Amino acid sequence: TLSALAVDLGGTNLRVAIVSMKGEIVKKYTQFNPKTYEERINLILQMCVEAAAEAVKLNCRILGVGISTDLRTPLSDTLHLPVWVDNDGNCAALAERKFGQGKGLENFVTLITGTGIGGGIIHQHELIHGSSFCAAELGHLVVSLDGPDCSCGSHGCIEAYASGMALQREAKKLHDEDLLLVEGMSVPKDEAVGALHLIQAAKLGNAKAQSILRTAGTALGLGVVNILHTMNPSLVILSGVLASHYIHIVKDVIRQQALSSVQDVDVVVSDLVDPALLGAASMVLDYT
Amino acid sequence: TLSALAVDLGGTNLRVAIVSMKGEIVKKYTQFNPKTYEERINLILQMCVEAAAEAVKLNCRILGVGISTDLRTPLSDTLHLPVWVDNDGNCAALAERKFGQGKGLENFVTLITGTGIGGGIIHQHELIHGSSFCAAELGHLVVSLDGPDCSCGSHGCIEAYASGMALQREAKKLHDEDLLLVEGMSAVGALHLIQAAKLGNAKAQSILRTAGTALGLGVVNILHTMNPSLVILSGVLASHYIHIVKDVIRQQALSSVQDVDVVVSDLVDPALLGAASMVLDYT
Ligand SMILES: [Zn+2]
Ligand SMILES: [Zn+2]
């Protein structure tokens, strides 16, 4: 069974999976993601060697290793396999291009809407990497002369407005002022307010919450509009835990403010589970 | 002299030229830009056979025609020549690629900064045209949730801020309140707003700081989308905006994209050069 190993060096955890050619995630390991790199590489090797060994047991011909994020040298040497590496935003795009709603499409965008915001740009069937390799930094599209502060150091970034972290900051500010919870809401002692709480408050009648969310969706929307006026893609795939939430307002912002010339674009929510791993996998699968 | 027939369609006058493969504008014909397309289409073919007639007298093989902006139908039939067509922004870019500071560059962007704002994106030595052929509508990058109104109907467009019309609108405003003229000067417009600024006016300077910032933020948006190796500012207002654009980037773009070079264009009649370049790029 033709396959590849996919590695996801993401938030908190480090995941490695055996992925089939048809996109099935055969087996999936998750572990702590060491902060320091010397150690992160070691863990990857081990998890790969185990995954690889298992693939031999599980009747799987592994073609190579793909990594979403000096990683190539040590892995190829040890595992006797080719290694491909690209960033999470690009891998998200590649997941859609191979297994998702990007199949076929010549020119499309994948915007990751979760803890943070990022994305990938397919054009002429291929990723746009950029001269400095850092193309498609979609979280730091600036839609304000004087916005909220952003973790990149600037302000106005659509990540500063519409990220999961962004919303959590807003959710905490209101809860600290006793302006978040409404008509019954109760937060656990352990758990701590986040975007769902902000949304639930809005959906349960919280005007302050609704306002905050309106701005976050508008900013993101204008982010997408900027993409449309730059790339004129045929499709935009919102992906991640906040995609479902943001799709309605993004379309509205597109109907409201985008040029007539680019309104035939379609915006969708991704169906893909574990896109990072699928994307990592898709590099190996595609080449070999 | 292996050459091409460049043709320009812009505001006010209509232009036509013979352009060498080297990039030399041999002859240039200007004229009126009629009310109607029936009037406008009649002039073009006449200017072309006029020009096409001359070319041969100046020993020049016209390989075809190029047009900035079913016109191939009348011309190709009449002139017996391949005719290419593409918009002003793209031609601005193609001009820089074949003849300007984009020579050899895989990924760069040309941003027109004049009466309007617009441009072209060259990625992998090629134009991005897009899904519905509306790529690089750069003047309508949004940098505000509540900006100035724009010609497109929306608001917060960099064109709405930094265009020569944008600046002209602001020039009329101040001058209506008699607060634009300042010790040292005597149809109001952008160039005056700049002098008033230069020669001491704070409201002028204030209006400009915002304009230049809005534009730079647009440029930043481009950098974070495309990660180009170079950004060429082209037009009557390029010389003006380049310093502030360089600053907004310095002050707000990611470390990753700071290696970008911003430059002002060298080309004269880039519209015509870009048009001609289409004919010359398909030999
Ligand atoms: Zn940012
Ligand atoms: Zn506009």
Author numbering:
A (entry chain A): 406 to 474, 499 to 717
B (entry chain B): 406 to 474, 499 to 615, 621 to 717
Which sentences did the original study use to describe this structure?
UDP-GlcNAc 2-epimerase/ManNAc 6-kinase, GNE, is a bi-functional enzyme that plays a key role in sialic acid biosynthesis. Mutations of the GNE protein cause sialurea or autosomal recessive inclusion body myopathy/Nonaka myopathy. GNE is the only human protein that contains a kinase domain belonging to the ROK (repressor, ORF, kinase) family. Wild type GNE forms homo-hexamer in solution, and allosteric regulation of the epimerase and kinase activities of GNE is important for the normal function of the protein.
Here, we solved the structure of the dimeric GNE kinase domain in the ligand-free state. The kinase domain also contains a DxGxT type ATP-binding motif. Comparison with the actin/hexokinase/hsp70 ATPase domains suggests that the disordered residues 475–498 form part of the binding pocket for the adenosine moiety of ATP and are located near the DxGxT ATP-binding motif. The GNE kinase domain was crystallized in space group P3121 with three molecules in the asymmetric unit. Two residues, H569 and E588, are located in the ROK family zinc-binding signature motif and H569 directly coordinates the zinc ion.
